[PDB]
Design an enzyme around this catalytic site. Structure first.
Site, PDB file in Angstrom:
ATOM      1  N   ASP A 107       0.818  -1.215   0.000  1.00  0.00           N
ATOM      2  CA  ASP A 107       0.000   0.000   0.000  1.00  0.00           C
ATOM      3  C   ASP A 107       0.854   1.269   0.000  1.00  0.00           C
ATOM      4  OD1 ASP A 107      -2.411  -1.385  -0.079  1.00  0.00           O
ATOM      5  OD2 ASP A 107      -2.522  -1.536   2.105  1.00  0.00           O
ATOM      6  N   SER A 108       1.622   1.447  -1.068  1.00  0.00           N
ATOM      7  CA  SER A 108       2.320   2.706  -1.288  1.00  0.00           C
ATOM      8  C   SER A 108       2.223   3.090  -2.753  1.00  0.00           C
ATOM      9  CB  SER A 108       3.778   2.611  -0.856  1.00  0.00           C
ATOM     10  OG  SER A 108       3.872   2.416   0.536  1.00  0.00           O
TER      11      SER A 108
END
Ligand code: MG
Ligand code: ZN
Ligand code: ZN
Ligand code: ZN
Lengths: 48, 44, 49, 55, 48, 49, 96, 134, 248, 64, 55
Positions: free
Chosen positions: H9-10
């Protein structure tokens, strides 16, 4: 009164002898960095 | 210093420790005038 | 194409325009540190400064 | 006294492209030039002044 | 490290060609679903 | 005289009732503002059903 | 703060706006006891269920499953390239 | 998957698109101060505190303040600067003031002066600061 | 706070770290010690008087900054108690007249009478006693301070209101009214002004508002009328020629 | 609030084209034709004009 | 002043810079799963009924 001052949650024993606020601690967001070892972390230069 | 009315925008020097009202408009919201020392920006 | 070496990428990448938003939680607001700061007066416990 | 703040206009100015055809080879880098902050050997000065009077 | 640096040569993604099926498959799926629904109706009528 | 009642904005008893966009902009108000809240000591309060 | 992914699974972290506290040892006995008791290489296997807590995770695992088939062949150039990233390397190139 | 910096989740984002205005924004903030007469003698007032007369000040600089005790809009106020100079008379003159929080690096947008409900003079100050995505 | 090794020339207080170190050489003379910043008998009547002050202030309906000083003025007058043997409500009312003047916005005794039972004479009497009691000076009245509300009460536009003020201002600078109460003068100026605009009003209505009569204005008008034309401000727009200004 | 001077992805200059877009649309050219005539082609430079909301024309209603 | 495009993206002189090589997978640098659904490149020299050059 001195009972209400030495009483339970956030008193002088549940709030100032077991749990206390400690100096020398900094918190910053985490982001990935695959060029580091497991043994390491990368600190910004302002915290350092 | 110099203040600007909030309705008629007519500058009027208000002296220290003096009521806050315009003239020719009778209004009670004043905005201080922009400074005159200069600051420089970057287009970056 | 790869940007560092100019070679093609063996797989084909799914690309297209989408609508993103910028949330309110920025990082300039969440960083803080303490090292021998001001302390309280009655209990002499570390206090905010 | 416009609608956009000062750092909005200072940003829409830098992205305007200027004719750099021939005199880029005669200009020093302002960090290399032996002058003060600015001189006509490593810079070019512009000027804008507009006032709206009609409705 | 070495598997990330090979992984920018090979590359990886998810599209929607990775999320669809051939008509032969879809028609077969539709056939069985219709049969299952009919069986439930047969169970409902006998209970009455 | 008895007292003073707060007034919900854009009601039939507000100063902004039935105005046109040429006048809503003249009082420095937004023509898109929905209304339906109170102004109490500067703040803007809303009542939850 | 920046940390390696293999360390995400103990802390139960994820990189969508988490925050992580850091404490700094002050005396020299406490830095020695943290060095000889609780470093992150010394805690790979757990006493809870006698297996490791840290394993290859996310993209690395998928790429490894695609790096180790039998139709995968590497030319001389990316053998040089990938062998540049080994810290525990002999110095010798294996015969293909 | 490009270089591993967008795992768990980046997002990786283009740096030379941020330089053309991508997702740039601004950030405003207001501060209130109200002069008050809490007692017959204890009275507050906006003025520029001088070192030898007033006593309780810190050694911070008081040059940005004007004669009124407020900062004119346009200056570049940084962390730990004083913006409003308010002195209390001692039963000589014991000064208070308002300082910024730390790490603002704003620019004073505009200053307003008027009378609140109970009729005490009070002022509001707005600070402008630009936020580039990082 | 004292160091044996060296004298302390300066001891800065570090607000940020709540610390106190001495610059000239350096020493925490104090480390982590600086925190970083029916029953009522007395004034049963005084206590009630401030409720009655508030109940008197309430009628005028305005930001009550004037009231707190009115409460402190009384408290002060109460404390000396030289004037203790006098009616409290008169003192309260006198405190009130003073505060308005102290705020540079006096209200007439006539007005102050409206909200109190005290005769103007006893308020004036008590007033002088307080001036003597508290040993403090006062200020002279200005006409313009009442131009606002009266013209407001007549809903007169600022231009008339402002014109009147000049007319009044010019008249007093010239002392065209030697000894004439500035209230009757302002009203006649207002009258003249109103008579110079479409917003004309009868003297009796004005007289009724200023709390005076119409014959009282008539005399003051007779005194200002000779200069009616020239007393007007240079920025004015007649609704009636000065020549056509009525006489009474 | 105001048309950006450069496409965020390419870098092609898009600021001067705003007035023209309104005019071509005014002339009744269908949007697809208008964009092509202006000459934008890549779908990253067409998103610039196709999805722009002009807020500067509503902040000019408040007297200075 | 004078600078280049590593300082800031206002100093680069170019819009999009196209670049490509090997218009047909003669080298199979990229691998199509179904080579029939892909449009033929602008620089290709293949027939209208072919997909890739032979490896
Ligand atoms: Mg999470
Ligand atoms: Zn005004
Ligand atoms: Zn130069
Ligand atoms: Zn583009």
């Amino acid at each position: 009164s001195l009972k209400q001052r030495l009483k339970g949650k956030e008193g002088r024993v549940r709030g100032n002898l077991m749990g206390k606020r400690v100096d020398f601690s900094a918190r910053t967001v985490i982001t990935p960095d695959p060029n580091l070892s497991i043994d390491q972390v990368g600190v910004p230069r302002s915290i350092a | 210093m110099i203040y600007i009315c909030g309705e008629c925008h007519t500058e009027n020097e208000i002296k220290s420790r003096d009521p806050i009202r315009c003239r020719e408009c009778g209004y009670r919201i004043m905005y201080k005038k922009r400074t005159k020392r200069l600051v420089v920006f970057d287009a970056r | 194409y790869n940007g560092f070496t100019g070679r093609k990428i063996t797989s084909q990448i799914f690309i297209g325009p989408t609508y993103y938003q910028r949330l309110k939680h920025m990082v300039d607001d969440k960083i803080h540190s303490r090292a021998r700061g001001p302390i309280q007066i009655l209990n002499r416990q570390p206090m905010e400064g | 006294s416009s609608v956009l703040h000062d750092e909005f206009i200072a940003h829409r100015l830098g992205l305007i492209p200027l004719t750099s055809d021939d005199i880029v080879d005669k200009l020093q880098y302002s960090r290399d030039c032996t002058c003060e902050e600015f001189c006509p050997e490593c810079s070019v000065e512009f000027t804008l002044d507009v006032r709206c009077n009609e409705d | 490290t070495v598997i990330n640096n090979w992984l920018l040569i090979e590359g990886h993604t998810i599209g929607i060609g990775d999320s669809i099926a051939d008509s032969k498959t879809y028609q077969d799926i539709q056939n069985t679903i219709k049969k299952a629904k009919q069986d439930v109706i047969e169970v409902i009528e006998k209970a009455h | 005289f008895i007292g003073k009642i707060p007034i919900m904005l854009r009601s039939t008893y507000c100063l902004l009732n039935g105005l046109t966009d040429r006048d809503l902009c003249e009082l420095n108000e937004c023509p898109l503002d929905p209304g339906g809240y109170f102004i109490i000591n500067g703040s803007e309060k809303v009542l939850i059903a | 703060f920046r940390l390696n992914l293999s360390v995400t699974t103990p802390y139960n972290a994820d990189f969508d706006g988490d925050e992580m506290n850091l404490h700094l040892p002050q005396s020299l006995e406490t830095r020695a006891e943290i060095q000889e008791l609780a470093m992150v290489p010394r805690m790979i296997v757990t006493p809870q269920s006698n297996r490791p807590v840290m394993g290859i995770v996310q993209d690395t695992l998928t790429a490894v499953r695609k790096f180790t088939k039998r139709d995968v062949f590497l030319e001389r150039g990316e053998v040089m390239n990938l062998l540049m990233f080994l810290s525990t390397w002999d110095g010798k190139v294996p015969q293909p | 998957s490009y270089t591993g910096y967008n795992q768990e989740d980046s997002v990786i984002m283009n740096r030379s698109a941020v330089d053309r205005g991508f997702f740039r924004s601004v950030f405003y903030r207001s501060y209130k101060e109200q002069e008050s007469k809490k007692g017959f003698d204890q009275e507050e007032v906006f003025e520029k505190p001088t070192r030898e007369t007033c006593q309780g000040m810190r050694h911070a600089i008081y040059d940005k303040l004007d004669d009124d005790g407020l900062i004119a809009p346009g200056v570049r106020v940084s962390g730990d600067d004083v913006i409003i100079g308010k002195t209390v008379t001692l039963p000589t003159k014991r000064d208070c003031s308002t300082f910024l929080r730390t790490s603002e690096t704003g620019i004073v947008d505009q200053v307003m002066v008027t009378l609140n409900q109970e009729g005490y003079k009070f002022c509001k100050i707005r600070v402008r600061s630009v936020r580039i995505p990082q | 706070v004292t160091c044996p090794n060296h004298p302390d020339a300066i001891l800065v207080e570090d607000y940020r770290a709540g610390d106190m170190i001495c610059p000239e050489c350096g020493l925490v003379v104090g480390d982590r010690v600086i925190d970083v910043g029916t029953m009522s008998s007395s004034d049963r009547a005084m206590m009630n008087a401030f409720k009655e002050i508030t109940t008197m202030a309430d009628r005028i309906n305005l930001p009550r900054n004037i009231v707190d000083r009115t409460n402190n003025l009384f408290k002060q007058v109460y404390e000396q108690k030289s004037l203790k043997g006098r009616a409290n409500d008169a003192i309260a009312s006198a405190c009130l007249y003073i505060a308005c003047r102290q705020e540079g916005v006096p209200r007439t005794f006539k007005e102050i009478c409206a909200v109190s039972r005290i005769s103007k004479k006893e308020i004036g009497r008590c007033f002088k006693l307080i001036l003597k009691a508290l040993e403090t000076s006062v200020d002279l009245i200005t006409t313009g301070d009442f131009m606002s509300r009266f013209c407001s009460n007549l809903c007169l536009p600022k231009q008339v209101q402002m014109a009147a003020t000049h007319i009044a201002r010019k008249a007093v600078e010239l002392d065209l009214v030697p000894g004439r109460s500035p209230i009757s003068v302002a009203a006649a100026a207002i009258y003249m002004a109103s008579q110079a605009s479409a917003e004309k009003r009868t003297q009796k209505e004005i007289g009724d508002i200023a709390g005076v009569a119409d014959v009282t204005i008539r005399q003051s008008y007779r005194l200002i009328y000779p200069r009616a034309p020239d007393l007007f401000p240079t920025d004015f727009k007649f609704d009636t020629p000065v020549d056509k200004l009525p006489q009474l | 609030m105001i048309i950006p001077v450069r496409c965020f992805t390419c870098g092609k200059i898009v600021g001067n084209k705003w007035e023209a877009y309104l005019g071509l649309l005014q002339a009744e050219y269908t949007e697809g034709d208008a964009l092509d005539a202006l000459g934008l082609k890549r779908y990253c430079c067409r998103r610039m004009l196709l999805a722009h909301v002009d807020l500067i024309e509503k902040l000019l209603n408040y007297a200075p | 002043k004078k600078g280049f495009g590593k300082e800031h993206a206002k100093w680069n002189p170019t819009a999009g810079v196209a670049f490509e090589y090997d218009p047909d997978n003669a080298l199979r640098h990229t691998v199509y799963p179904k080579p029939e659904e892909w449009p033929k490149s602008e620089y290709s020299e293949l027939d209208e009924d072919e997909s890739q050059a032979p490896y």
